[PDB]
Amino acid sequence: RQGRQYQAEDLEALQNELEARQEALSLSVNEGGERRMEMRQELEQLKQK
């Protein structure tokens, strides 16, 4: 379902990788949304100018 194979001898590495990325999840969504909406208001000021 994911990857192709990972040693049953270590689940922990996969746990940590997914931990890191899911931690990046919230940060990335905030980044995208905030930057895009901010530059949208910038568009608006440019329009009025």
């Binding site: 049953a8 001898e9 746990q15 997914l18 990325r21 990046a24 999840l25 995208g32 895009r36 949208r40």
Partner: protein, 50 residues
């Protein structure tokens, strides 16, 4: 300012692509996590050549 708008649109497109991507892969990763965390988290004990 018209060029500014043009580049602003370019940046909009870039951000849209980035956001759609990242959120999709993050959902998929959450799902794979769910699988591992729920089912596997310690059963390697048993999988360990018991």
């Amino acid at each position: 300012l018209r060029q500014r708008h043009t580049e602003l649109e370019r940046e909009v497109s870039r951000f849209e692509d980035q956001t759609q991507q990242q959120r999709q892969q993050y959902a998929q990763a959450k799902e794979s996590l769910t699988t591992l965390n729920r089912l596997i988290p310690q059963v390697t004990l048993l999988l360990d050549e018991t």
